[PDB]
Design an enzyme around this catalytic site. Structure first.
Site, PDB file in Angstrom:
ATOM      1  N   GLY A  17      -9.743  -7.187  23.955  1.00 49.10           N
ATOM      2  CA  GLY A  17      -8.280  -7.226  24.153  1.00 49.10           C
ATOM      3  C   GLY A  17      -7.535  -7.766  22.941  1.00 49.10           C
ATOM      4  N   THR A  18      -6.198  -7.753  22.995  1.00 46.93           N
ATOM      5  CA  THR A  18      -5.299  -8.235  21.911  1.00 46.93           C
ATOM      6  C   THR A  18      -5.321  -9.768  21.886  1.00 46.93           C
ATOM      7  OG1 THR A  18      -3.292  -8.249  23.259  1.00 46.93           O
ATOM      8  CG2 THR A  18      -3.796  -6.195  22.128  1.00 46.93           C
ATOM      9  N   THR A  19      -4.924 -10.369  20.760  1.00 42.59           N
ATOM     10  CA  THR A  19      -4.933 -11.841  20.554  1.00 42.59           C
ATOM     11  C   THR A  19      -3.764 -12.464  21.324  1.00 42.59           C
ATOM     12  OG1 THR A  19      -5.858 -11.452  18.361  1.00 42.59           O
ATOM     13  CG2 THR A  19      -5.116 -13.692  18.835  1.00 42.59           C
ATOM     14  N   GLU A  73      -0.031 -10.973  20.767  1.00 44.82           N
ATOM     15  CA  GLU A  73      -0.021  -9.744  19.931  1.00 44.82           C
ATOM     16  C   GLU A  73       0.150  -8.535  20.860  1.00 44.82           C
ATOM     17  OE1 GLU A  73      -2.978  -7.608  16.661  1.00 44.82           O
ATOM     18  OE2 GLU A  73      -3.909  -8.711  18.313  1.00 44.82           O
ATOM     19  N   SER A 128      -5.520 -12.120  27.685  1.00 44.67           N
ATOM     20  CA  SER A 128      -6.152 -11.063  26.859  1.00 44.67           C
ATOM     21  C   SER A 128      -7.237 -10.381  27.695  1.00 44.67           C
ATOM     22  CB  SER A 128      -6.717 -11.638  25.588  1.00 44.67           C
ATOM     23  OG  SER A 128      -5.701 -12.252  24.809  1.00 44.67           O
TER      24      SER A 128
END
Ligand SMILES: [Cl-]
Ligand SMILES: [Cl-]
Ligand SMILES: [Mg+2]
Ligand SMILES: [Mg+2]
Ligand SMILES: [Mg+2]
Ligand SMILES: [Mg+2]
Lengths: 5, 195, 195, 240, 243, 244, 221, 250, 204, 231, 5
Positions: free
Chosen positions: E29-31, E46, E74
């Protein structure tokens, strides 16, 4: 009921 | 619904049941048969609350007929009366009890004896030589106490029954439009057409 | 006759000791001041059975609260009482005063009448005998009283409530809630009657 | 599939129970419990590897009731699962039966729950060993320990974790010498000093104030020590 | 073997492979980050701009619980939403019974017990999210991070997603350089920088910055989104630091 | 989910057989042999106890022969624990019938209902069937003396003489050989014991390894008596027929 | 009439032995003292079936609890279980109990009312004759009673009920629960209401009653 | 969520074996030796107290349990499974008997209720059988003294004397030689201690042995006086001291 | 509409020397109307006798219920139930219907086959046990029976003498109650023989 | 492979294969395009037929006077989800006298799809939806995927060869966004967008399906001769 | 009903 200041 | 009588004699049980169906100030019908054949040698007459009577009688009839098919065998009058009593005994503590009083006239083929059972809506069963439900009893019981003998024939039983109907027609307030009479013996159930 | 009074150092709960069945005194030494937490107590009025059942459940809730989230606020305790009293208002007769000492909030008093409504007050009076001391308590109550002044205020108030209310009497129990800890006080008839 | 759910293997074993025991040591923490005259002391290693962690929130010791304390050897999720249940059970007991749940009765209750997971298929065992400590008003200073098998027993003293055996024999050798069932000491402060001293000897490591976690049970209350309470305790050991 | 095919099954190691597999979905996943400050907490995330066709500022990922708690996550976004929906029910029933808004440690355990419950049965799947959350209560500011296993701790700084190691390294420097504490307005600026620095690990698609915060002084102890001038001020600060 | 670990106890084989019923019958084939023989004036129930130990309490023991009511008894073959579940159900069913009709339950009606319960476990519920075969010995005023058997399938049939459990193949041949319709109880007792004595896997048939019961009209005038034989009574009947 | 009186080293409870069915005495010697556990006893007033049924149920659950916890049962446990049960039934279970006993905590004396309210005291009285008994207790009770003084006060309080209350009569049952000792149940401790010799024997000459039929009944199988 | 295991985990194998019961019996085989001997005037049940650790207090763990005042139980196999069976056995003695008939159940019927519980764990959905064999010693007015074994299957057998667990094969052979129908209770306790010494390896004293009897009524253990018909429990657990006294004259 | 006084009827039980007696009237009616003069109110389950007064449907129902329970008891226990045990079973079964009770006044009578002790007990409709040395009464003429029994009864009567006392107690009590009488039955119970006698009484 | 038996199982790389297989059912589905300006939102759907004798599968469903979607994949699943939206839109109206926000509509669909991906026995929805609407914050277009992921966009397309229309809208973004107070021109842009996803087949009168909602325009669907204008 | 000191 009964007991009931 | 009002008058249902039963007389057990030597070799048969005789049930007499009033033909009148009254609602308010109108006799709607004067030819009502207040009985159901439960089995070839067992007949149940009934009286009480409108609707409840027939609904209960047919429910019992269905259950006994189901038993007969399943076992290819006819339940004894004693067995049927015990089954009916238990159904009423359950009913009285239901949300809406069956308000139905019944007489069960049967011929036990194993014992070769006629049997008359009186069961009220509470599930109060008694075996009797003669029985009645409602106000009928208040006249017929004292009359039968006097005239009834245990060794009487079917014909003597019908004359004894005529004596009851005459007394009821004389002293009963309501017109119950005569009775349908049925005999239960070793040869099964038949109706007396001329009474 | 019950009351809870906030003052400079915290809060004091007060109550009589009379339990009645009609005009008979079932218990003359009753304890109506009951612990639901270390420094959260309640005054019980109405049904003895209902108020006991409620206080027992609240004490259970606040013990389980403490195990998970640490010491509950006096407001939290009053909320749990309200929830029980409000949601079961049709089946309860309970007039409860909730009183507790926080170190942040100091002395707080919440009254919960029959309906299950919550009222945060500087002081609260309740029970049959409270009616007779509304005038007296309103005229004599001051905010930020000393311990001795508050004890005299409760003593004089309940003295009058007991004097006029037949449903109130016996001893005057009091519970002092401060940073110092929990102090139980008792005052006997021979003292408070002749005030 | 006899190794996936809690049914018997041909040799009469429950592999899922045995594997739950190995999950116990996943945290790599050693716990120790001893009894004084008036008190029961429990100590556990505190390892905070990440610098970003709030060290105050890193704990494997739980206050179940006012009187009962519980230290867990095993992963924190299962540890907290057990803690919340024990708290509810201890609260319900007090409400129903009108007195504070004893340490050994709570231990039995949690052990019976653990037993159900070893017999019922849909529930997995918890990968935790629960050490319950109190000063019971009837039985006095009490240590009762539960495992994933649903086994439980009372202890004179006990240890749990990877280097449990080294601590166990260290304590065994002491009670052979002292000839008694407890630490003959008046104050709980010196019973904590005993607990830490014998853990240092057994593990062969030194401890700072932040390397240890201490729980103390006295009559009518169980409480955990702050970093400064432990530091004060470490100073007393060093000065003797 | 086959120990990894079913949830709630212990391997011979004593591990739940299905939970470890859920962590892989989180790592993918995204930060997202959390920074604890003087009198509150700051959350940043993010948001990968997959296409020009994405409406800017109108795919909000940070979620509020009650009025005082912020949640960011995330991994599988739907799983995160399910966890927050539960968090809101837990917070509602707490306030209903106890009147006071749910404390953050209390709230943290409510999610913890719920996520842990999804590792107890083979009829459910573990959560495919690490959740960073916290806020302000009576006892002050609290930051938490919750993992698929149900494991959570208190944090000074927290990071999860594809750029967690980059973000963790940058978080560790703030803790070392600010022992007395970091201010709320500073933490917002730092949050922006760390997301931009953590974006180096996801630099194919350009991204959109989203920040929220709870602060006793700045937001009056309530959760608010950072928007307009304060957001652009934080972006400009981050843009200056990468160059 | 849980689908992985489901044995699917209530399914057909490609050949149209119920796996679990077939395997339950395989289980029952290792159980101590039980024989029922119906005579004109009574019924015999004989059953072999499973490899007895000398320190087993024999007199206060019940493994094979159970009483359902005053007129009906059963010989068990298979898991005893399973049989006791079904026996308690059968005992309750008999009392329900008596309570309803004020008449002792006809034998077939009790057998059918108990067989209908077994059937249920083969068609629905996903549970293992009862690893039990019964020999029902009973009397009613309709059909008189009756022998039935039920098995895990929930199928029941009537018999003049029948064996269940171990060595039924060998036992049924011997019964078919020596049985005749005008047979008395005392003769049926001798046949039952002689059949076990030859089919037994034991060295010699002794009193301590047997359970025995008769249902005669041997009571005073037109009433049925159930006799569950005592150890000493089996010892005497075994000597009287010249087996020991 | 039922009473409970605390003393030095324990507690004593007492009861009359009259059971009524309207104005009729159904049982002249019924036992109103019930054993919940060996050293926890219960005096019961109100609906006779309810006091017996509720005392047996909690006594059963106390035994199972005592086995589970490997501990002697406590009076507060019986008190809590009884009051929660009675409260749940909103007074429809008409059991008015004086619960007393000794346990590891000490000696205890409580009363429970049908609606689920409990009271603590050194002396208590329940039932129709509670006012007659409480008058005696209020007159003669003092702090620091001995065993023999507490039995005397308790039996005197029951006697007040027996004589002055029509609801109470016949005999006085007592149970003494002393700390460190076995509880002693004193069935018919006092019998001050013995029936005087009848003036005449009403034994009939054999054959006085007219009979219609005789028959041997078969009890055997 | 919810228990989706509504199907049997114990099923018949092609050979006719019930695997989980067989495997449960294997777990009982591994279990520590326990035995029961029936005398004319009492019953004795005994077992070794296998201590998990010398730091553990073996007094807190009771392998011999009171079910009713006149019935006791001991086991071989999985301790936790036994503990919950004792809880259920004590409760079912009340709910299904004492609360109906106002008296404790006879040994055979309580055994029957325990057997039922263990049978259900053999057939019910999503459960394994109990991994224990019980020995239940008891007395009742009409049956006198009795001793029953209960297996994981739910099968129970009455015994004059028997042993279960580790060294049951050797222990049963030993009991066959020594047992007669004229044994007094003290003679049965003596034989129980001799039989158990063969299976025990380490220390053999009152602290490592757990032994209880079903014998005469104990008015001193009743806890109250005043009711003549109540004469006290026939179940008594022998103390550590009482065992050591009989080990000297061994 | 008082269930306990629709059908009418009485039961009385007495103890003697190594014997017990239990008697009942035969009347079943619907208020004023007498319906049956053969309605017996005494049943037996082995050697334990149960008399039941009150609502006739519940009398019949409870008889069928206790036959049911005593039959299962005997199959499982492998022995006949004793009067002390049966008494507890009746109490249990009645209190089970505490808030919808059977409108009955049952009476247990019998001799313990082990101890040989004569035993009688009475119950209210919700199962409260009334144990007695002397006598138990039940029915619409309970006041009358209490008066007759309390005056006529003496301890340690021989079976032949006890028969006369219980018969005279029932007969004279029934003759002062409109809803009781119409015949009577007396059971004399010794350790291992039971005699049943139908009394001649006035049929009004 | 071994981890695609049900939705409750994660793969070693942290993938849900049953959700991915459900996503695959959308790619096989007929192309549908969504795009909006500030005043209006437009759905364009290429309908698919079994053969020349069959009707064309209806792709667009109305949810309220101000909201509706187009479907791609399992049509019965679209019927279940559209019915749920109708009830949620309707609940908002009856209880709060409030038109349901298109953003909340997305959140409700996300949460309904999610529950089917975490529980044993159930399955993921096998359909993608493009929800358009006009609420108190103007025109909206949402893209629903049965993974649970809902995304607010200016324009998009889902189904077979949807990449063609999606590239076109990505180029045309600046043009069509400013088509305010002009329905017919916004549709033309949508019809030209879906034309970039055509192969061998062209837009006919009973093939094309258009829907529009906007400021003074209730959600209305155009089929048959009503779309002949835009060919 | 009933029995009722
Ligand atoms: Cl109170
Ligand atoms: Cl438990
Ligand atoms: Mg006053
Ligand atoms: Mg499991
Ligand atoms: Mg009369
Ligand atoms: Mg008359």
């Amino acid at each position: 009921x009964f007991l009931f200041x | 619904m009002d008058i249902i009588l039963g007389i057990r004699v030597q070799d048969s049980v005789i049930l007499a049941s009033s033909k009148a169906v009254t609602r308010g100030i109108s006799v709607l019908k004067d030819s009502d048969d207040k009985t159901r054949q439960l089995s070839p040698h067992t007949l149940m007459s009934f009286a009480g609350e409108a609707g409840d009577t027939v609904q209960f009688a047919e429910y019992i009839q269905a259950n006994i007929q189901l038993y007969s098919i399943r076992e290819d065998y006819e339940l004894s009058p004693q067995a049927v009366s015990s089954f009916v009593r238990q159904e009423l005994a359950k009913s009285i503590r239901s949300r809406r009890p069956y308000q139905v009083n019944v007489l069960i006239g049967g011929y036990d083929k194993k014992k070769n004896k006629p049997e008359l059972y009186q069961i009220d809506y509470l599930g109060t069963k008694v075996e009797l030589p003669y029985g009645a439900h409602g106000y009928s009893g208040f006249y017929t019981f004292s009359l039968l106490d006097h005239h009834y003998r245990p060794d009487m024939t079917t014909e003597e039983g019908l004359d004894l029954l005529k004596l009851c109907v005459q007394e009821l027609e004389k002293r009963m307030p309501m017109d119950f439009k005569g009775v349908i009479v049925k005999i239960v013996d070793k040869d099964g159930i038949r109706q007396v057409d001329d009474f | 006759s019950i009351m809870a009074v906030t003052f400079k150092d915290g809060v004091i709960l007060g109550a009589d000791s009379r339990t009645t069945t009609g005009a008979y005194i079932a218990n003359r030494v009753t304890d109506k001041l009951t612990r639901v937490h270390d420094k959260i107590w309640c005054c019980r009025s109405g049904s003895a059975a209902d108020t006991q059942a409620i206080a027992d459940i609240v004490q259970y809730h606040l013990e389980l609260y403490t195990s998970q989230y640490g010491t509950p606020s006096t407001e939290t305790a009053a909320s749990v009482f309200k929830e029980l009293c409000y949601e079961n208002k049709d089946n309860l007769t309970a007039g409860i005063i909730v009183a507790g000492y926080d170190d942040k909030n100091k002395g707080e008093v919440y009254t919960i009448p029959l309906g299950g409504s919550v009222h945060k007050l500087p002081y609260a009076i309740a029970g049959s005998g409270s009616t007779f001391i509304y005038g007296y308590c309103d005229k004599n109550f001051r905010e930020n009283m000393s311990k001795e002044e508050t004890v005299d205020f409760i003593k004089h108030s309940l003295s009058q409530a007991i004097k006029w209310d037949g449903s109130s009497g016996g001893v005057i129990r009091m519970v002092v809630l401060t940073a110092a800890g929990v102090e139980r006080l008792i005052f006997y008839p021979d003292e408070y009657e002749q005030l | 599939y006899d190794r996936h759910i809690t049914i018997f293997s041909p040799e009469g074993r429950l592999y899922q129970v045995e594997y739950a025991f190995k999950a116990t040591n996943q945290t790599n923490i050693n716990s120790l419990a001893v009894r004084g005259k008036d008190c029961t002391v429990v100590i556990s290693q505190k390892k905070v590897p990440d610098k970003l962690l709030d060290p105050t929130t890193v704990s494997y010791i739980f206050c179940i009731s006012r009187t009962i304390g519980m230290v867990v050897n095993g992963p924190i999720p299962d540890a907290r699962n057990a803690a919340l249940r024990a708290k509810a059970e201890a609260a319900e007991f007090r409400y129903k039966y009108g007195y504070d749940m004893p340490c050994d009765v709570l231990a039995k209750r949690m052990a019976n729950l653990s037993q159900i997971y070893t017999q019922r298929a849909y529930m997995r065992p918890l990968g935790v060993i629960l050490t319950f400590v109190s000063v019971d008003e009837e039985l006095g200073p009490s240590i009762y320990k539960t495992d994933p098998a649903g086994y439980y027993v009372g202890y004179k003293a006990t240890a749990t974790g990877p280097k449990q055996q080294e601590i166990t024999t260290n304590l065994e050798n002491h009670f052979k010498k002292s000839k008694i069932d407890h630490i003959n000491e008046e104050s709980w402060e010196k019973v904590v000093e005993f607990a830490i001293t014998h853990m240092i000897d057994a593990l062969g490591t030194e401890f700072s104030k932040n390397d240890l976690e201490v729980g103390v049970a006295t009559k009518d209350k169980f409480f955990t020590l702050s970093a400064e309470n432990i530091e004060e305790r470490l100073v007393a050991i060093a000065e003797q | 073997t086959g120990y990894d095919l079913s949830n709630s099954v212990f391997s011979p190691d004593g591990r739940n492979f299905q939970v470890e597999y859920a962590v892989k979905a989180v790592e993918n996943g995204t930060t997202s980050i959390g920074i604890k400050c003087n009198d509150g907490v700051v959350f940043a995330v993010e948001k990968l701009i997959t296409s020009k066709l994405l409406v800017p500022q109108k795919n909000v990922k940070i979620q509020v619980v009650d009025r005082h708690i912020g949640c960011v996550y995330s991994g599988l976004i739907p799983d995160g939403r399910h966890l927050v929906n539960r968090g809101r029910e837990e917070a509602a029933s707490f306030k209903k019974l106890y009147k006071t808004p749910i404390p953050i440690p209390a709230f943290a355990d409510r999610l913890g017990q719920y996520v842990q419950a999804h590792t107890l049965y083979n009829s459910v799947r573990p959560f495919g999210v690490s959740t960073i959350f916290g806020g302000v209560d009576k006892n002050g500011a609290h930051l938490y991070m919750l993992e698929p296993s149900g494991s959570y701790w208190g944090y000074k700084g927290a990071a999860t997603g594809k750029g967690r190691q980059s973000a963790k390294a940058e978080l560790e420097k703030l803790v070392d350089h600010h022992p007395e504490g970091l201010s709320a307005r500073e933490a917002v600026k730092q949050a922006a920088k760390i997301i931009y620095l953590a974006h180096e690990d996801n630099k194919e698609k350009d991204f959109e910055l989203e920040i929220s915060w709870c602060s006793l002084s700045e937001t009056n102890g309530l959760h608010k989104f950072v928007k307009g001038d304060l957001l652009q001020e934080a972006i400009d600060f981050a843009q200056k630091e990468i160059n | 989910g849980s689908r992985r670990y489901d044995s699917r106890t209530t399914i057909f084989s490609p050949e149209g057989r119920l796996y679990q019923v077939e395997y339950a019958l395989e289980s029952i084939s290792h159980a101590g042999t039980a024989i029922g023989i119906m005579a004109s004036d009574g019924i015999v129930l004989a059953a072999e106890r499973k490899v007895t130990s000398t320190l087993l309490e024999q007199d206060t023991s019940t493994e094979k022969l159970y009483k359902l009511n005053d007129k009906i008894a059963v010989a068990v073959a298979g898991l005893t624990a399973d049989a006791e579940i079904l026996i308690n159900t059968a005992r309750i069913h008999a009392q329900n019938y008596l309570k309803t009709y004020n008449e002792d339950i006809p034998v077939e009606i009790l057998v059918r209902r108990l067989s209908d319960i077994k059937q249920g476990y083969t068609q629905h519920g996903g549970l293992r069937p009862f690893g039990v075969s019964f020999i029902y010995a009973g009397y009613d005023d309709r059909y008189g003396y009756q022998l039935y058997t039920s098995n895990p399938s929930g199928n029941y049939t009537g018999w003049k003489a029948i064996s269940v459990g171990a060595n039924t193949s060998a036992a049924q041949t011997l019964l078919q050989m020596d049985y005749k319709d005008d047979m008395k109880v005392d003769d049926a007792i001798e046949l039952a014991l002689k059949t076990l004595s030859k089919t037994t896997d034991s060295s010699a048939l002794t009193y301590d390894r047997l359970e025995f019961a008769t249902i005669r009209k041997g009571a005073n005038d037109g009433e049925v008596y159930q006799k569950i034989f005592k150890p000493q009574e089996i010892k005497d009947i075994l000597v009287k027929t010249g087996i020991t | 009439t039922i009473v409970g009186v605390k003393f030095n080293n324990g507690v004593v409870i007492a009861a009359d032995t009259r059971s009524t069915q309207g104005p009729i005495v159904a049982d002249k010697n019924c036992a109103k003292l019930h054993r919940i556990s060996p050293k926890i006893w219960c005096a019961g007033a109100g609906t006779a079936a309810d006091t017996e049924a509720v005392t047996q149920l909690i006594g059963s659950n106390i035994e199972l609890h005592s086995l589970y916890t490997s501990r002697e049962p406590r009076v507060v446990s019986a008190l809590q279980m009884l009051k929660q049960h009675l409260f749940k039934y909103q007074g429809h279970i008409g059991a008015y109990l004086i619960v007393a006993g000794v346990d590891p905590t000490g000696s205890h004396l409580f009363s429970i009312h049908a609606h689920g309210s409990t009271d603590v005291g050194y002396y208590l009285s329940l039932g129709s004759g509670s006012l007659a008994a409480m008058a005696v207790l209020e007159s003669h009770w003092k702090q620091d009673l001995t065993k023999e003084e507490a039995i005397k006060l308790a039996s005197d309080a029951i006697q007040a009920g027996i004589w002055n209350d029509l609801g109470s009569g016949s005999n006085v049952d007592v149970c003494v629960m002393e700390i460190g000792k076995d509880a002693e149940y004193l069935r018919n401790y006092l019998t001050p209401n013995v029936r005087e010799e009848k003036q005449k024997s009403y034994k009939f000459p054999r054959g006085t009653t007219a009979v219609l039929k005789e028959s041997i009944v078969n009890i055997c199988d | 969520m919810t228990d989706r295991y509504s199907f049997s985990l114990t099923t018949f194998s092609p050979s006719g074996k019930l695997g989980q019961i067989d495997y449960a019996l294997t777990a009982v085989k591994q279990g520590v030796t326990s035995l029961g001997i029936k005398a004319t005037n009492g019953v004795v049940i005994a077992t070794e107290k296998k201590s998990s650790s010398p730091l553990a207090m073996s007094e807190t763990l009771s392998k011999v349990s009171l079910l009713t005042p006149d019935i006791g139980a001991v086991y071989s196999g999985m301790g936790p499974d036994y503990r919950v069976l004792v809880d259920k056995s004590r409760k079912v003695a009340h709910t299904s008997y004492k609360r109906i008939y106002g008296e404790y159940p006879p040994t055979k019927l309580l055994v029957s209720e325990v057997a039922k519980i263990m049978q259900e764990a053999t057939q019910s959905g999503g459960v394994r059988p109990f991994g224990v064999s019980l020995l239940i010693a008891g007395h009742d007015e009409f049956n006198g003294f009795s001793l029953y074994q209960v297996d994981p299957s739910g099968s129970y057998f009455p015994w004059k004397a028997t042993a279960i667990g580790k060294g049951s094969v050797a222990a049963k052979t030993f009991l066959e030689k020594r047992w007669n129908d004229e044994l007094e209770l003290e003679d049965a306790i003596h034989i129980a201690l001799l039989t158990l010494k063969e299976s025990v390896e380490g220390e053999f004293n009152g602290d490592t042995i757990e032994l209880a009897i079903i014998g005469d009524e104990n008015p001193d253990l009743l806890g109250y006086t005043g009711i003549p018909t109540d004469k006290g429990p026939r179940f008594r657990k022998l103390t550590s001291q009482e065992i050591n006294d009989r080990l000297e004259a061994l | 509409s008082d269930p306990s006084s629709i059908n009418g009827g009485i039961v009385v039980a007495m103890t003697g020397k190594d014997c017990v007696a239990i008697a009942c009237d035969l009347r079943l009616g619907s208020q004023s109307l007498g319906v049956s003069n053969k309605f017996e109110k005494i049943f037996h389950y082995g050697h334990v006798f149960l008399g039941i007064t009150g609502l006739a449907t519940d009398v019949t129902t409870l008889n069928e219920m206790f036959r049911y329970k005593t039959n299962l008891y005997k199959l499982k226990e492998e022995r006949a139930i004793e009067p002390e045990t049966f008494t507890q079973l009746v109490s249990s079964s009645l209190y089970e219907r505490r808030f919808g009770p059977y409108f009955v006044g049952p009476v247990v009578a019998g001799i313990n086959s082990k101890s040989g002790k004569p035993f009688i007990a009475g119950f209210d409709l919700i199962g409260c046990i009334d144990e007695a040395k002397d006598f138990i009464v039940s029915g619409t003429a309970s006041d009358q029976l209490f008066g007759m029994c309390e005056s006529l009864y003496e301890p340690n009567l021989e079976p032949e003498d006890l028969f006369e006392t219980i018969s005279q107690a029932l007969l004279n009590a029934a003759d002062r109650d409109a809803l009781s009488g119409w015949g009577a039955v007396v059971y004399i119970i010794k350790k291992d023989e039971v005699v049943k006698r139908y009394l001649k009484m006035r049929q009004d | 492979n071994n981890y695609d038996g049900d939705t409750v199982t994660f793969s070693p790389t942290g993938r849900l294969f049953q959700v991915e297989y459900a996503l695959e059912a959308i790619k096989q589905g007929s192309v549908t395009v969504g795009l909006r300006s500030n005043t209006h939102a437009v759905l364009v759907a290429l309908k698919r037929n079994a053969d020349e004798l069959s009707s064309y599968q209806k792709k667009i469903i109305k949810c309220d006077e101000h909201m509706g979607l187009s479907l791609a994949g399992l049509a019965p699943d679209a019927r279940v989800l559209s019915n749920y939206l109708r009830q949620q839109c309707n609940y908002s109206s009856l209880v709060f006298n409030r038109k349901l926000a298109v953003e909340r509509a997305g959140h409700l669909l996300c949460d309904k799809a999610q529950k089917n991906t975490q529980s044993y026995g159930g399955r993921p929805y096998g359909v993608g939806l493009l929800i358009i609407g006009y609420d108190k914050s103007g025109a909206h277009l949402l893209e629903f995927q049965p993974s649970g992921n809902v995304t607010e966009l200016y324009g998009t397309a889902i189904g077979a060869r949807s990449q063609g229309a999606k590239t076109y809208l990505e180029r045309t973004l600046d043009t069509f966004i400013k088509i305010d107070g002009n329905p017919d021109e916004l549709i033309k842009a949508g019809v030209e967008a879906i034309s970039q996803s055509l192969r061998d087949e062209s837009l006919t009168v009973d093939n094309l399906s258009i829907a529009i909602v906007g400021k003074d325009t209730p959600f209305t669907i155009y089929d048959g001769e009503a779309v002949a204008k835009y060919i």
